[PDB]
């Protein structure tokens, strides 16, 4: 029935986003506000092609956008973000409601700096 085409391992290499789920959740809203365009392009490719092998470059672009976003976040509000995601990480359900002061500080920093 024919053989299955697969990408090489070298083609699958990309810089990785290696922050935990609490870190991702603490920055989720700003991340979706800033990196919207590459993510939407990747999702449209994914839902139109119906094949993960045809949207690899879009995934690499998504990783690059996330890396740039987190580099900026590190560059301007390391400490408020660290406090906010530590607060989020302590919770067993990772709840937004239990840490609003740290979220307010992080929001103020990102608004003023960027």
């Amino acid at each position: 029935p024919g053989i299955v085409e697969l990408p090489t391992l070298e083609d699958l290499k990309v810089q990785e986003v290696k922050v935990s789920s609490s870190v991702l959740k603490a920055a989720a809203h700003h991340y979706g506000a800033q990196c919207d365009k590459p993510n939407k392009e990747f999702m449209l490719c994914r839902w139109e092609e119906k094949d993960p092998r045809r949207c690899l470059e879009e995934g690499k672009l998504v990783n690059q956008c996330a890396l740039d976003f987190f580099r900026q976040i590190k560059r301007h509000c390391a400490e408020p973000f660290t406090e906010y995601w530590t607060c989020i990480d302590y919770s067993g359900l990772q709840l937004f409601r239990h840490c609003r002061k740290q979220q307010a500080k992080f929001d103020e920093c990102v608004l003023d700096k960027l």
Binding site: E16, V17, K18, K50
Partner: protein, 105 residues
């Protein structure tokens, strides 16, 4: 025998639950949505006698998705050959397979 009351009145008493490719809640897809969709679109309007012959390929793919007999046969063949090779001692299996792999997110 069959009085197609639903078709005559356009009621849809039970047709919503006849197939897995039909409007699930929250758009949750069946495991074999595409195969069933292709088979149904192939067999539509030509009758059962013709569909049993001319849509045999789509139906075979759908049944393979449903029960996965050939996939297990192929996996078992690969595993048997690998086990024979290691028993003979010529296999030399890789670190990722053994759990020493460098995981990615």
């Amino acid at each position: 025998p069959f009085f197609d009351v639903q078709k005559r009145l356009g009621l849809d008493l039970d047709r919503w639950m006849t197939i897995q490719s039909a409007e699930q809640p929250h758009k949750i897809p069946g495991r074999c949505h595409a195969f069933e969709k292709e088979w149904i679109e192939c067999a539509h309007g030509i009758g059962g006698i013709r569909a049993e012959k001319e849509c045999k390929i789509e139906f075979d793919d759908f049944v393979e998705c449903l029960l996965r007999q050939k996939t297990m046969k192929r996996l078992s063949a690969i595993k048997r050959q690998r086990d024979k090779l290691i028993k003979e001692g010529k296999y030399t299996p890789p670190p990722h397979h053994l759990g020493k792999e460098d995981p990615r997110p």
